[PDB]
Nucleic acid binder design. Structure first.
Lengths: 57, 189, 66, 140, 139, 58, 139, 72, 101
RNA sequence: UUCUUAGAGGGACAAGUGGCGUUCAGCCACCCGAGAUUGAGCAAUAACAGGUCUGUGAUGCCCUUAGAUGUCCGGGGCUGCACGCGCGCUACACUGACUGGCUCAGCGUGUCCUACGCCGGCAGGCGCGGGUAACCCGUUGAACCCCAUUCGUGAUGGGGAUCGGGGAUUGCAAUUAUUCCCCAUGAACGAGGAAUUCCCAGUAAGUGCGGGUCAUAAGCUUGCGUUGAUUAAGUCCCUGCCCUUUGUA
């Protein structure tokens, strides 16, 4: 069964927030600037913007 | 033609004093079927001068905590009061109302110049609007207060008050208070 | 009360001394030309400038504005 | 409307002084153990006209009102109206009137004080027994 | 052959449908005289008394009211009726007749044609209402 | 001798809390008779006062 | 002449008088004892309240269709006064509404809906519109 | 002070009502109860009975205020 | 091919209006029967909480709004064409849900 | 597509007219108009030895660390009452209570919101449906108010505190009574001394409804409509504020 539009848009909000908090505490040393999440039913992509990518790879 | 409650005419009514002749609205072009207008007459200054005097009465009727927004009932209180007035005296109630407001208005008031605790007042003149304001306020407080805890209803109490006030009877609360305010102005001068 | 700020004043002035020949006395024409003339941030700001431009264009005929 | 010929000014029923002046339905509320609800149903069940003033009731009518007030169960008054529904001792349904209600109350208070139940102790000390805050309020 | 206009007061809305006929006057399928707040019955009779029944002769209006409260509905319906008539006497009669109606209606009370714009003001934290604040105790 | 007076101009607002207002009044019985008076409540040009004491000053 | 064309106050009294005169309305055993809601302090004064309630119920069901026991409980709701606690909206008695609808079903005036609620029967619509006829005729 | 008003009519008040009420400028439950020292219910009942006979006219009926008057 | 509907839901208005307009003009040029944007009531999520962590201040309150704008576009077109027209239109900050019958 | 939802774009600028203004910035009045001041959010520089380590896996020192200040399980307490203060709710009635009839909302929430049918006076008990929601609850048949009835200045059919019995719902568990219902009991209170708060128009106030707490749940706060005023368009007198002169130990 599927959840409401209201709960769904909230859930995506918490997902974004928690992912950011995790990424900050992990990649702080490699100057993690921000994240961008695009979602497709085939596969959802997460794009990390950081100062020195050579290191975070 | 236009008649108040479709049964009281506004042509046979007559104003006495010229001072209030442009500060009591009830006339040809201010003739309304009901007091209830729901206008913006308290929007800016000197706009309530153009409010029908019957509306000013029924507005100043719904005063104390329990009847603050109970206009629909003050309109029927004024309707019953007007019928009682006509039954008692015989002539147009609007004339009795105008006569009551003409008599009840204090002509010379007292203003506070000095310190708090001590009493020191200068006697001053009263504006025609302020005369109309205090007259209505005093009439309603007299009605209200007189009928608070006794059997006679607000309608016949308001009628009794306006009968007394219109013919300048000492029994009227509004006349007593006017007399006292002018006597205090007379005491100061 | 309502006083025209340095922003609308400065803008209105430079508009006059650039496009004097384009403007006239009518508010709505000045309002419409002010859109084409300047890249302006919002409608209110444009309305206020158009209004004060109208106000200046009145007194320019009366005498030379400083 | 009409002049009363024998207006019984004071009624002496169930060791109580009933004022005939008040209307019968509210007149009998003066009896302890009878409210503005139980009085109504009692009169309706005896099919008396409630409009009548308490002073102008005949001997048989007031005697019927007494006997129907004493034994309600016989006259099809429901179980959920009775003041005493399940009596702690004998476990029967009854309506207790003035002297009976006072006696039953002091007996129930005595019964609670006998066993040393919290409510009994809170009653014996003259405190609240429904678990209100007794700090800020409830003075004297 | 017909026109349809709305009268609005606070959150009350009364839509009057005006067509040709035998001077029929119905609001939510009920006559004006049978409207519940009878104390203000005259407020509904305002537009028909001011103009006169003769103008309503060749006009059937059907009013439907939704939202608001009782007196707000009364002001919505009494506004809607007058706006419907002037709209009909604009579209299917000379402009002179519309002016001859409009001037009388405006001259009596401007509320009959122009809507009272004010609405119930938003409430703020720190008080019970929109302006009033809770009691502030020093010691 | 209770006599009426027209209000021509409002001079200014006076009193400890500006509760009063100072006005120059032209009488009704005499055309050209100006006097300065202090009056309680709201006033404007044209308003007529009923002066009980017509000799005092402000 | 229709129910909407007459006064809705007098109509109920007329219909109640008709429902009394019929003498085939199954009144419960507990009419003399029971209140009419959670929030009423006393029993209703009038002895024939069931007939007035039945009349009211029929009139409500005439005005709109698909009204269940819950809706009828929502109709005859009022203001519960809670002593020192502030007053809240309380609903009517479910049993009285159910027994009234059962009793009116008994007359074949109202029948159950395929959708789920209860609608007035053509026999009902006849009776109600007839009562309106003579209520109008009495002026 | 305490107002001991009469629940039911006595002969001295009842004959006084049937003679004198019938002709007052204003007719109502309040003034009748006040003047004759009657209870509110009996005074309200008396006016209804006088209207049934047809000595007094009903001017306007309402919940709060019922106004009566003499004829001619 | 029967009655596919497309539910576009977003928090931004501009992006939602742009993408929905593109889907419409993309469908219109192919000569397909399209029922236009059905704008439903905007869902406003309100949270009102005290500003302070501790609770000593003048009892100030934040007012957090969250807007949800929902558009319905309806097509009478084959599923093969519906799949590719729904496939081409992707945007970060809009959710699309397609339903048939 | 008028009403309903809501995207784009229009619309108001002291623009037009008349006065007053070193004819400058601008001010007051008036016409035409839906409107000629709508209500908020955001808010600098420089500081409080302001509050919070009991929001945190934000945190330095210190105190304890295995008969612990860790953690968990049973109880009890946080509510304990000769008294003094601070927000409040219900009232003191007749412009009012009670009984019946009539007729209108808006914000917004539901994986727990609830229609419909049956049984019980009522709280509620069963059965079977709709809704992850402009779809079902719901045309959100709300209360004051409106129209009839009874009451009659009586601590009264005002007021419902305190107390006795019963009968239900949560929950593992209800006693120091969780809420809820019924019958009974019927206290102070007749408008409040010195003192003192809040407020300018859809405002004050009356009046209900939804959200947050929420297994059970509003006398609280946070929102929403509904009915809807009196008085003022001013002043620096009180209490403070901003700028400028001075005076200072």
């Amino acid at each position: 069964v599927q959840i409401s539009k209201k709960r769904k848009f909230v859930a995506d909000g918490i997902f974004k927030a928690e992912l950011n908090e995790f990424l900050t505490r992990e990649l702080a040393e490699d100057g993690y600037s921000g994240v961008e999440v695009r979602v497709t039913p085939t596969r959802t992509e997460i794009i990390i913007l950081a100062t020195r990518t050579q290191n975070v790879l | 033609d236009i008649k108040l409650f479709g049964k009281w005419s506004t042509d046979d009514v007559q104003i006495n004093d010229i001072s209030l002749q442009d500060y009591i609205a009830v006339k040809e072009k201010y003739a309304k079927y009901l007091p209830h207008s729901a206008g913006r007459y308290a929007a800016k200054r000197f706009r309530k001068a153009q409010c029908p005097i019957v509306e000013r009465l029924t507005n100043s009727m719904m005063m104390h905590g329990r009847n603050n927004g109970k206009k629909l009932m003050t309109v029927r209180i004024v309707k019953h009061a007007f019928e009682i007035i006509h039954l008692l005296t015989g002539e147009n109630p609007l004339q009795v109302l105008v006569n009551a407001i003409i008599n009840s208005g204090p002509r010379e008031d007292s203003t506070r110049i000095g310190r708090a605790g001590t009493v020191r007042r200068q006697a001053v003149d009263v504006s025609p609007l302020r005369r109309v304001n205090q007259a209505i306020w005093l009439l309603c407080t007299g009605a209200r207060e007189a009928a608070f805890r006794n059997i006679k209803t607000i309608a016949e109490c308001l009628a009794d008050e306006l009968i007394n006030a219109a013919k300048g009877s000492s029994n009227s609360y509004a006349i007593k208070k006017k007399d006292e305010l002018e006597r205090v102005a007379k005491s100061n001068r | 009360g309502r006083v025209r700020t340095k922003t609308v004043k400065k803008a209105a002035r430079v508009i006059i001394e650039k496009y004097y020949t384009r403007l006239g006395n009518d508010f709505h024409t000045n309002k419409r030309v002010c859109e084409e003339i300047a890249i302006i941030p919002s409608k209110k700001l444009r309305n206020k400038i158009a209004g004060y431009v109208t106000h200046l264009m009145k007194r320019i005929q009366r005498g030379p504005v400083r | 409307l009409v002049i009363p010929e024998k207006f019984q000014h004071i009624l002496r029923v169930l060791n109580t002084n009933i004022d005939g002046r008040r209307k019968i339905a509210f007149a009998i509320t003066a009896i302890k153990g009878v409210g503005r609800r139980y009085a109504h149903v009692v009169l309706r069940k005896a099919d008396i006209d409630l409009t009548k003033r308490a002073g102008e009731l005949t001997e048989d009518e007031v005697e019927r009102v007494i006997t129907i007030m004493q034994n309600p169960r016989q006259y099809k008054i429901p179980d959920w109206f009775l003041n005493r529904q399940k009596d702690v001792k004998d476990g029967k349904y009854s309506q207790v009137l003035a002297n009976g209600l006072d006696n039953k109350l002091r007996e129930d208070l005595e019964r609670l004080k006998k066993i040393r139940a919290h409510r009994g102790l809170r009653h014996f000390w003259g405190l609240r027994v429904r678990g209100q805050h007794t700090k800020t309020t409830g003075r004297r | 052959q017909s026109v349809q206009v709305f009268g609005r007061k606070k959150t009350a809305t009364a839509v009057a449908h005006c067509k040709r006929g035998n001077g029929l006057i119905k609001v939510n399928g009920r006559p004006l005289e049978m409207i519940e707040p009878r104390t203000l019955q005259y407020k509904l009779l305002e537009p028909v008394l001011l103009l006169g029944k003769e103008r309503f002769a060749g006009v059937d209006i059907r009013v439907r009211v939704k939202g608001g409260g009782h007196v707000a509905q009364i002001y919505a319906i009494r506004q809607s009726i007058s706006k419907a008539l002037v709209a009909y006497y604009q579209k299917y009669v000379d402009e002179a007749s519309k002016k001859e109606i409009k001037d009388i209606l405006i001259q009596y009370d401007r509320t009959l044609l122009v809507a009272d714009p004010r609405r119930c003001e938003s409430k703020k934290f720190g008080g019970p209402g929109a302006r009033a604040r809770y009691q502030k105790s020093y010691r | 001798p209770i006599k009426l007076a027209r209000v021509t101009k409002v001079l200014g607002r006076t009193g400890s809390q500006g509760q009063c207002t100072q006005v120059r009044v032209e009488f009704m019985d005499d055309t050209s008779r100006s006097i300065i008076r202090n009056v309680k409540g709201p006033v404007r040009e044209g308003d007529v006062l009923t002066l009980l004491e017509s000799e005092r000053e402000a | 002449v229709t129910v909407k064309d007459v006064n809705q106050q007098e109509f109920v009294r007329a219909l109640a008088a008709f429902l009394k005169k019929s003498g085939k309305l199954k009144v419960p055993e507990w009419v003399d004892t029971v209140k009419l809601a959670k929030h009423k302090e006393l029993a209703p004064y009038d002895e024939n309240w069931f007939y007035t309630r039945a009349a009211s119920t029929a009139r409500h069901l005439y005005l709109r269709g698909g009204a269940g026991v819950g809706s009828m409980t929502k109709i005859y709701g009022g203001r519960q006064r809670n002593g020192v606690m502030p007053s809240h909206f309380s609903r009517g008695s479910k049993s009285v509404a159910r027994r009234v609808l059962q009793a009116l079903e008994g007359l074949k005036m109202v029948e159950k809906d395929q959708d789920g609620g209860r609608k007035l029967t053509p026999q009902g619509q006849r009776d109600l519109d007839r009562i309106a006829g003579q209520v109008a005729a009495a002026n | 002070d305490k107002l001991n008003n009469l629940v039911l009519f006595d002969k001295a008040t009842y004959d006084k009502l049937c003679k004198e009420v019938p002709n007052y400028k204003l007719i109502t439950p309040a003034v009748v109860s006040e003047r004759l020292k009657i209870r509110g219910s009996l005074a309200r009942a008396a006016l209804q009975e006088l209207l049934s006979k047809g000595l007094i006219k009903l001017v306007s009926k309402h919940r709060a205020q019922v106004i009566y008057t003499r004829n001619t | 091919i029967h009655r596919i509907r497309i539910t576009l839901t977003s928090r931004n208005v501009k992006s939602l209006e742009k993408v929905c307009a593109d889907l419409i003009r993309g469908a219109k040029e192919k000569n397909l029967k399209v029922k236009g944007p059905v704008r439903m009531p905007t869902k406003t999520l309100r949270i009102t909480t005290r500003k302070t962590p501790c609770g000593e201040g003048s009892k100030t309150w934040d007012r957090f709004q969250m807007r949800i704008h929902k558009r319905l576009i309806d097509l009478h077109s084959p599923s093969e064409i519906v799949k590719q027209i729904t496939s081409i239109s992707i945007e970060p900050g809009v959710e699309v849900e397609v339903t048939i019958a």
